[PDB]
């Protein structure tokens, strides 16, 4: 957690009665609760971005709906921004003025684009904003598979098999659940 490791890809295997000394619950129920909280935060952020961009409808109602609306809105907008920045006659001021996420980034510490910043720095800032939007969309899409499954055990199995990239377990827990791990189709490198 102190290093650059995502909490969504981090999971812990063991008994549910053990006390978690970490600040965040790394168990299956704790990971599900953290994913639900991240999904709610991403839905609120997507609703705020849709209100700033003037997108009609409730885009923060569901994670799949948020992903579809985010694609159908941002992808033409990001393509238009990239086409405008691809022109050789477009300067840093034109690139800053053509950014469509200025209202969404208004909550950030002003200025988003410095006046002394060159075209490269403005392009880097726009790419950082687009990467933040894409990371929010990816978090919503990752939390969508948990919301699609209804059973908690099925959601935990789907998270451990595919969604989890780092899984920490004890030797006794690995030995007791070796057959379950083999039957679940979980693969490690």
């Amino acid at each position: 957690v102190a290093l650059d490791i995502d909490e969504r890809h981090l999971l812990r295997l063991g008994h549910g009665e053990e006390e978690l000394e970490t600040e965040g619950s790394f168990s299956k129920h704790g990971r599900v609760e953290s994913f639900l909280d991240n999904r709610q935060r991403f839905l609120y952020e997507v609703s705020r971005l849709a209100a700033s961009m003037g997108a009609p409808g409730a885009h923060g109602n569901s994670a799949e709906t948020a992903g579809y609306f985010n694609k159908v809105y941002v992808e033409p907008a990001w393509a238009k921004f990239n086409d405008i920045i691809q022109r050789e006659d477009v300067g840093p001021e034109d690139i800053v003025r053509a950014f469509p996420f200025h209202a969404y980034f208004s909550d950030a510490p002003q200025p988003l684009f410095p006046p002394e910043a060159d075209r490269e720095t403005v392009l880097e800032i726009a790419n950082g904003c687009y990467r933040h939007i894409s990371k929010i969309f990816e978090e919503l899409a990752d939390v969508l598979p948990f919301e699609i499954l209804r059973r908690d055990k099925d959601k935990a199995n789907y998270l451990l098999t595919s969604e989890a990239r780092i899984i920490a377990m004890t030797s006794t827990h690995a030995a007791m659940k070796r057959g379950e791990i083999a039957s679940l189709g979980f693969q490690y490198d």
Binding site: G57, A58, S62, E64, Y68, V72, P145, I148
Partner: protein
């Protein structure tokens, strides 16, 4: 699309401008376009109603793609892409609707894209009850 609206639909346009979120005026305009207007004008009015009011279940259930089903999808792929975008917007607004999902599945089965139809069927199975 400007020529698709005539003087008869001018009162309907004024009523839509006065009340942009009225389900009854939109339904009345759709019924007037279906009863008197041409197929292209009715399709344009239905597309405008779906774009303006995508959360209306009655508008989504009464949506028809019969104006593009009679054409070859290999030559009329632009109309198929527009219908796919409209269905994506409807699924963004009405993801819990089973009738809209069935209509989208039928439209995908009409098209020859096997992988896209399989992905749509998987998404419908994962997203519905």
């Amino acid at each position: 699309d400007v020529a698709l609206v005539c003087e008869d639909d001018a009162p309907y346009e004024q009523d839509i401008l006065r009340n942009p979120g009225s389900i009854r005026p939109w339904l009345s305009y759709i019924e007037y376009k279906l009863q008197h207007g041409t197929l292209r004008e009715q399709a344009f009015v239905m597309e405008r109603a779906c774009v303006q009011l995508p959360r209306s279940y009655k508008l989504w259930k009464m949506f028809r793609v019969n104006h593009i089903s009679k054409l070859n999808p290999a030559i009329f792929a632009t109309e198929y892409q527009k219908v796919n975008a409209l269905f994506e917007r409807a699924l963004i607004l009405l993801n819990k609707m089973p009738r809209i999902w069935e209509m989208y599945l039928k439209f995908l089965m009409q098209q020859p894209l096997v992988t896209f139809t399989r992905r749509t069927f998987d998404r419908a199975l994962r997203a519905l009850p």
